[PDB]
Structure 1
Amino acid sequence: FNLISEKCDILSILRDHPENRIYRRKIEELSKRFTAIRKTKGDRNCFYRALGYSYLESLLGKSREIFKFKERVLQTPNDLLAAGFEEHKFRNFFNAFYSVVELVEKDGSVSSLLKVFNDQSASDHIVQFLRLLTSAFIRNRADFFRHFEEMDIKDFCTHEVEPMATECDHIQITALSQALSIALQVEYVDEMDTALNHHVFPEAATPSVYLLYKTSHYNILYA
């Protein structure tokens, strides 16, 4: 479980910042609203890896939701092709993502899903697919995403989205949420003496997924 941990009690992360009063206060507050946490490896891929695992876990046993999601994933090669990615170059990454969606449908266990996300090869193929889809979605809707002036959208996607180990910001989160119709909530724990606070992507929605963002790193929360 080197990439995505077993579920732990929320207060188990107090030990990561001992005697730091603001982190202690915010984790204590968070523990009133969430019961458990899964840790992710900090390798610059943790947003994509956490979102991928948590969203697919939330689908286990939900036959209609799985069927609708599989219908969208089957269309995603057209998004990639429209943005100028070539099929022979994304095929191996698309096939890895489609395989793990079929595992959710046909196998349906937390233990099998956790095994795929902790297999370095399968998990990294999944992350790379999600990065190319994020890039395609931004490229194909450049008029909308210019808002997140001096930098080309194309150059942003080439440098800060497509390469493995490049960190996320609001733009990548909004884009992948829109590209796969995944509603998620991010809880922010920074070192300032401020209120524990969150954002929902998109604004109106009931979240499937809760993430904790802290020391530029994304972990999974359970309500």
Structure 2
Amino acid sequence: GAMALKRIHKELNDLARDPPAQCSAGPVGDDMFHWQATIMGPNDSPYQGGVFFLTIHFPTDYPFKPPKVAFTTRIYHPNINSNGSISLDILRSQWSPALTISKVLLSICSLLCDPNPDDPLVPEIARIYKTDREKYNRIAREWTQKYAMGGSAYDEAIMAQQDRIQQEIAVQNPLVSERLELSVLYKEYAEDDNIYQQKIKDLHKKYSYIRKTRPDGNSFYRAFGFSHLEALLDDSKELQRFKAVSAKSKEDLVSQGFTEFTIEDFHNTFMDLIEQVEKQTSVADLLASFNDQSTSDYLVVYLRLLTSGYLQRESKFFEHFIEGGRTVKEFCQQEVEPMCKESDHIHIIALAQALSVSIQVEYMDRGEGGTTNPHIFPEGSEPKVYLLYRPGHYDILYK
């Protein structure tokens, strides 16, 4: 019934509030009754280091019946048949309506650390377990290092890692925070770091405010976007001149080989964001629009595509600037087009020239003096947009 799907959400919330690091699951796209779970081999067991996927199907009537759960990954265990099904009987005889999936897979993770040789699904693996242990361990280790440990698979786990990270990174940091005086920076740093406090004293010198961006790997593009968009909240001639280049950029890119229908999406987010500049919105309204996950990210995607576009356009300007042995396009596909990939000097110059605008970047790292080096790109153009580079991260500054 509807109570079923109603319940699966409750269980997903329970699994949500507490991540079970090694043992975790989730639905497949659209489908609520189809789940899939990644399970890492627990350490101090022959299965360690390998990754074991398993698929879950919920009954049409939950939770009056147990979910069907089976390993899609081959594994050597007395309680898991090589056909993939598990011998744990809370899924069969002993099932209760009061049990979460959490209980199930945390009982499976427990089935891996400690096997169950007395109630075997496969009698031979049980027999080997109860008699010759070294055999069992070694076998389980190659069954790990072929089937579980192999290649691809790992990616999903390593992707999960990323997801686990920049979600909690997103719990501390918002996309674009408020406009705060930069005196807060003093508090971020240590008392044994005097050198930094000197850089920051010397920062209070030039700029009265700061606005911070989430370190998602897009730091630069996010900062660039908000700063330049609020910068056009004043200059009307520049707002129009900007708007025109934006509109040109779309077909400029399509005629540069990018598929149109896919980049149109991002284009319209750019143009609507410009549209709440054009019709003047108070800066906080824009910020609210920027702290929208999809609106923001769609923008960032477009900015990346625009740097890519100008790079392809200029390829000879660049190609011998490229660190390593790649091309310009190879470097685009690797280091620029994809999301959450770091931005460098080339990126900033490329985007700046692409939209034909000036930016100032304040560099502060370990430099001996109280010197925080300004960088105006391209040179001499008096910048109305100011950013701060701390190592590995970009934010924005206000005069």
TM-fit CA distance, 1:105: 0.6
8 Å CA contact retained: 1:134, 1:179? yes
1:116 matched residue in structure 2:
289
TM-fit CA distance, 1:200: 0.8
1:86 to 251, 259, 270: 259
Q: Matches of residues 32-181 of structure 1 in structure 2 within 5 Å?
A: 32-148=205-321, 150-181=325-356
Aligned residues: 223
8 Å CA contact retained: 1:79, 1:133? no
8 Å CA contact retained: 2:361, 2:388? yes
Instruction: Report the TM-score when normalising by structure 2.
Output: 0.54
- Separation (CA, whole Å) in 2 of partners of 1:16 and 1:82: 47
Q: Which amino acid aligns with 2:354?
A: A
1:29 matched residue in structure 2:
202
- Separation (CA, whole Å) in 2 of partners of 1:78 and 1:45: 25
8 Å CA contact retained: 2:233, 2:280? no
TM-fit CA distance, 1:144: 0.8
Name which of structure 1's ranges 96-105 and 149-158 shifts more when overlaid on structure 2.
Answer: 149-158
Identity among equivalent positions (%) equals 47
- Separation (CA, whole Å) in 2 of partners of 1:65 and 1:192: 36
- Separation (CA, whole Å) in 2 of partners of 1:77 and 1:89: 11
8 Å CA contact retained: 2:180, 2:209? yes
- Separation (CA, whole Å) in 2 of partners of 1:172 and 1:78: 21
- Separation (CA, whole Å) in 2 of partners of 1:162 and 1:124: 13
2:140 matched residue in structure 1:
none
Name which of structure 1's ranges 9-18 and 112-121 shifts more when overlaid on structure 2.
Answer: 9-18
- Separation (CA, whole Å) in 2 of partners of 1:16 and 1:199: 24
TM-fit CA distance, 1:192: 4.2
Deviations 1:184-219 (A, max 9, x none): 011111134353212111012010211100031011
- Separation (CA, whole Å) in 1 of partners of 2:329 and 2:181: 42
Larger radius of gyration: 2
Q: Which amino acid aligns with 2:339?
A: M
Task: Please tell me whether residue 215 in structure 1 is matched to residue 388 in structure 2.
Answer: no
Deviations 1:129-179 (A, max 9, x none): 100111011001101112426221111100110111111111000000011
Structure 2, gaps ≥5 residues long? 1-172
8 Å CA contact retained: 1:79, 1:137? no
- Separation (CA, whole Å) in 1 of partners of 2:358 and 2:215: 23
2:178 matched residue in structure 1:
6
2:381 to 202, 205, 214: 205
- Separation (CA, whole Å) in 1 of partners of 2:190 and 2:181: 16
Q: Which amino acid aligns with 2:334?
A: H
8 Å CA contact retained: 2:360, 2:383? yes
Q: Which amino acid aligns with 1:184?
A: I
Instruction: Report the TM-score when normalising by structure 1.
Output: 0.96
- Give the secondary-structure state (helix, strand or coil) at the position aligned to 2:274: helix
